[PDB]
Design an enzyme around this catalytic site. Sequence first.
Site, PDB file in Angstrom:
ATOM      1  N   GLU A 196       0.886  -1.061   0.109  1.00 34.70           N
ATOM      2  CA  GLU A 196       0.001   0.026  -0.140  1.00 34.70           C
ATOM      3  C   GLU A 196       0.909   1.059  -0.165  1.00 34.70           C
ATOM      4  O   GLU A 196       1.798   1.480   0.810  1.00 34.70           O
ATOM      5  CB  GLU A 196      -0.801  -0.070   1.277  1.00 34.70           C
ATOM      6  N   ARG A 250      -1.466 -11.003   3.318  1.00 37.76           N
ATOM      7  CA  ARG A 250      -2.763 -11.785   3.300  1.00 37.76           C
ATOM      8  C   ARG A 250      -3.494 -11.281   2.012  1.00 37.76           C
ATOM      9  O   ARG A 250      -3.280 -10.395   1.446  1.00 37.76           O
ATOM     10  CB  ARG A 250      -3.620 -11.671   4.288  1.00 37.76           C
TER      11      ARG A 250
END
Lengths: 81, 163, 82
Positions: free
Chosen positions: B36, B52
């Site tokens: 991110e 994940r």
Amino acid sequence: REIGLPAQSEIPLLGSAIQCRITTEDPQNGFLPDTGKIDTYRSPGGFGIRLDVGNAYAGYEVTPYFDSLLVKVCTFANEFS
Amino acid sequence: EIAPAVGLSPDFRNEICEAAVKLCKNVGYVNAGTVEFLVKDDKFYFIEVNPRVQVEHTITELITGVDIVQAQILIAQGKDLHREIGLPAQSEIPLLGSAIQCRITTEDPQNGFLPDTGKIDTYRSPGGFGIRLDVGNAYAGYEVTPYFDSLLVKVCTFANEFS
Amino acid sequence: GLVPRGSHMKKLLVANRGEIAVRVFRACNELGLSTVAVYAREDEYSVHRFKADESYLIGQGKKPIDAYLDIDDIIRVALESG
């Protein structure tokens, strides 16, 4: 120009896809389509699944007057298998 | 959430993707994960990795043709992305149109997004070309409890053009 | 390039609930794996419970979210179910 389709050589060819039509045709009764009320209708989803429903929903009464289609199911994936 | 980032230039998006890869290469990242970044005026800054799968993985599957959850499971079985799972090389990874995901919840927007509870009387789900549904707990008769999240169904759309 | 021992799979268990559990079961089934769900008592009507090939109650007597965070009970189910 307006609809935006490319030239013929540029039309995509992505993976493969399959369509099944799910009907009330009873395969143990010579594919005679069944009639009556639908008690339960749960439709799957996920990646690579497309559904185009006919007349199928909880409560719907399937009549003898029209075709027996409940839902059209398509799958799509990069590989045919 | 949308995919790809249609409002940013393809060079700039590609630079972001390479930075994420560089980090993951450096640590030998295995399985699915997400990097991110915050982005501001053609600069980008790392903020986190989520190691994940994510709720919004669906839209990436639609614009790439890649089944990410299957991939996770096959990686965990020790398989090679290219050789056995069948993914092409990086530059060959498809980029097909765009996709959008909304989560439909019982959050009431006129009551401060407080999640409603109670029984579902009617649940009719749409379909057609360009529509993907991943249902949570929603079906005719289901009682929404106050104990878990308020998600009913995730809806994704996809098409050649964003509009 | 080292693959852990025991990487071959026939059955997979999702330590979760709801849409993401259903999403994983679908992938499993398409890969020829059998599936196992876990559910808290209060979540017993969750679609994911009925989408797995097998399912087991976990976190008996706990609050429902604590049930899904019950590490030892989830492992218990994975081992018992094979």
